[PDB]
């Protein structure tokens, strides 16, 4: 009988897909980086 | 005076989600009755296994090609419980 369609099952996949997006940190190391800084402002002296 | 030997299936499909088409005799070689007699209320009751609960081969909306001893016409099943009633088509 076609009533079998009422007891149909569905399959759910456990592997999720994250939308196409950038993972960031593309410019890491591209500029002069100072790690472990402290304070609200960091000053870089410059000479002419 | 319904005779099971004179009823036959027309529609070949086994899909029970749609209607079926039947053909019934009634000419001199069949049950030998008029179309009006065959189309009377409860005539096809003997075809159902249990007409009180509407259990049987006939379903609502089926098309029966009735072939009486005088004329012939298309008929459509309207109800199957508590009687099998048909209307012209």
The continuous run of DSSP H or E covering B38 comes out as: helix B35-38
Nearest Cα residue to B62 out of B14, B22, B10: B22
B10: preceding bond cis by omega (within 30 degrees): no
Residues belonging to chain B: 89
Torsion sign across C-alpha atoms B86, B83, B70, B23 = positive
Please, which experimental method was used? Answer: cryo-EM
Interface test with A, best of B13, B17, B20 (most A CBs within 10 A): B17
Q: Are B86 and B44 in contact (CB under 8 A)?
A: yes
Q: Are B83 and B56 in contact (CB under 8 A)?
A: no
**Burial grade of A30 (CB within 10 A; 0-12, 13-18, 19 or more):** exposed
Residues 2-41 of A with CB under 8 A from B: 2-3
Residues of A within 8 A of B19 (CB-CB) are none
CA distance B41 to B81: 11
C-beta atoms of B15 and A2 within 8 A? yes
Residues of A within 8 A of B16 (CB-CB) are 1-3
């Amino acid at each position: 009988s076609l009533a079998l369609s009422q007891i149909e099952i569905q399959q759910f996949l456990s592997e999720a897909h994250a939308e196409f997006q950038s993972e960031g940190f593309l410019l890491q190391g591209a500029v002069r980086t100072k790690s472990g800084t402290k304070g609200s402002i960091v000053h870089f002296p410059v000479f002419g | 005076a319904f005779g099971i030997n004179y009823m036959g299936r027309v529609s070949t499909s086994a899909n029970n989600d749609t209607q079926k088409v039947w053909i019934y005799n009634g000419t001199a070689t069949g049950s030998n009755e008029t179309v009006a007699t065959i189309a009377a209320s409860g005539y096809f009751n003997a075809f159902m296994v249990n007409v009180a609960l509407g259990k049987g081969p006939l379903g609502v909306g089926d098309l029966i090609i009735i072939n009486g001893n005088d004329a012939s016409a298309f008929y459509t099943v309207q109800t199957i419980t508590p009687n099998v009633t048909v209307s012209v088509f």
